[PDB]
Amino acid sequence: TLDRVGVFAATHAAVAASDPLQARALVLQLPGLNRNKDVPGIVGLLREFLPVRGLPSGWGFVEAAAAMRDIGFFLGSLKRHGHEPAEVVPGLEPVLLDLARATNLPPRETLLHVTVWNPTAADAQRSYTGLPDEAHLLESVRISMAALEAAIALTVELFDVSLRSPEFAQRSDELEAYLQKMVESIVYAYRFISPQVFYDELRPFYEPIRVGGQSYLGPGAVEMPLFVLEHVLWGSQSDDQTYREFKETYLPYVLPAYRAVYARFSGEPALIDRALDEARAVGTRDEHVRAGLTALERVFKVLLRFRAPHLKLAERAYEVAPSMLGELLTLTYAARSRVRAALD
Numbered sequence: 001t002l003d004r005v006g007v008f009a010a011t012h013a014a015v016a017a018s019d020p021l022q023a024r025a026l027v028l029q030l031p032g033l034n035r036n037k038d039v040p041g042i043v044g045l046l047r048e049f050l051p052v053r054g055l056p057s058g059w060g061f062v063e064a065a066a067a068m069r070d071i072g073f074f075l076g077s078l079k080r081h082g083h084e085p086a087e088v089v090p091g092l093e094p095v096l097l098d099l100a101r102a103t104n105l106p107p108r109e110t111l112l113h114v115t116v117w118n119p120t121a122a123d124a125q126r127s128y129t130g131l132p133d134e135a136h137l138l139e140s141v142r143i144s145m146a147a148l149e150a151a152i153a154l155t156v157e158l159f160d161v162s163l164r165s166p167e168f169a170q171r172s173d174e175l176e177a178y179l180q181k182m183v184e185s186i187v188y189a190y191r192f193i194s195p196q197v198f199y200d201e202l203r204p205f206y207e208p209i210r211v212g213g214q215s216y217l218g219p220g221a222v223e224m225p226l227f228v229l230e231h232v233l234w235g236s237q238s239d240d241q242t243y244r245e246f247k248e249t250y251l252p253y254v255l256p257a258y259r260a261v262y263a264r265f266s267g268e269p270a271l272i273d274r275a276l277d278e279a280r281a282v283g284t285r286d287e288h289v290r291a292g293l294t295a296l297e298r299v300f301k302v303l304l305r306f307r308a309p310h311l312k313l314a315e316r317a318y319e320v321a322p323s324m325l326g327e328l329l330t331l332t333y334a335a336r337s338r339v340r341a342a343l344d
């Protein structure tokens, strides 16, 4: 039904199938060492597969990203136990910088590496903790990542579609359907992840580390390129400084193609701004304008159906939540209100 997902899932699978360092059996031993708080052991295990003579010349994006995944779980782990990985693992930093170069991504593991680029099988899936709650956490992202990527494409396409065209309503309805996957992710996360286990056992693995003289944030669904989609959709011309800073903070962590989309739309009115302007010019007596606006409103509804429950999810875990969440929620409500005002 959501036919556009396939190509994105296939691209994810290529990295997930790659094991260029033959590290699968080794990384699977990491959870045990974490449980034992065995820092020398963790370093020792990493040094069993960490390249010491640079990267094999034949590697492309896929191998480099897969290598970063496998090294990456050791990064979050060492930091969890209170150590900067670059400080305790000799020769690690040059490898991380080389892998960053090869992938055009930060010099550590990101959400992509630990979720959609991470194989799904029990005898292959990499994990910090080996806990079922972590497996559920990763599953929650896998539910919606490909759909979100498809949704970014649909949003960019919709940008150039006239509100006067029947296509506007059709594409918006299609966009809504892909975004529904985000809602499904939160339902799954709320049902299957223990807040206590998340806060006490998982959260400590996602702390920032220092590489190349700056700090890089750990993996999180906050790195999902939803903020890029919404930049195009409603946020590009926002004067909200904190919101602007949020986007600029996470921009480095998303795929190069999405950083390019972000740049393309920064100096432009957002989709909503163009659509509402077109509606005032043409009038809502045009049925395609009415239907377009109504369909657009449903896109905002689904975004709110992700964002509101997510805030509850976050609050429950953190009661064992960051102000930015509430602030973004308020901005989203205001965006929807603009669409609703245009229909009155």
Ligand code: HEM
Pocket (backbone or CB within 6 Å): 140, 141, 144, 182, 185, 186, 189, 193, 198, 220, 221, 222, 223, 224, 226, 227, 307, 310, 313, 314, 317, 318, 321, 322, 324, 325, 328
């Ligand atoms: C128990 C599970 C979860 C917890 C505790 C949690 C917590 C948080 C927190 C505290 C933030 C604010 C930024 C930060 O401090 O990192 C955030 C942001 C965010 N999270 Fe989650 N999260 C969870 C699950 C998820 C899931 C399953 C998804 C989607 C698959 C998701 C998507 C996002 C997105 C897109 C943001 C950026 C803000 C926004 O768009 O509203 N989170 N999360």
Ligand SMILES: N[C@H](Cc1c[nH]c2ccccc12)C(=O)O
Pocket (backbone or CB within 6 Å): 137, 138, 141, 203, 206, 219, 220, 221, 222, 223
């Ligand atoms: N920081 C929150 C919660 C979180 C931390 N690590 C992961 C991994 C996968 C999904 C969510 C999270 C966030 O970014 O959503």
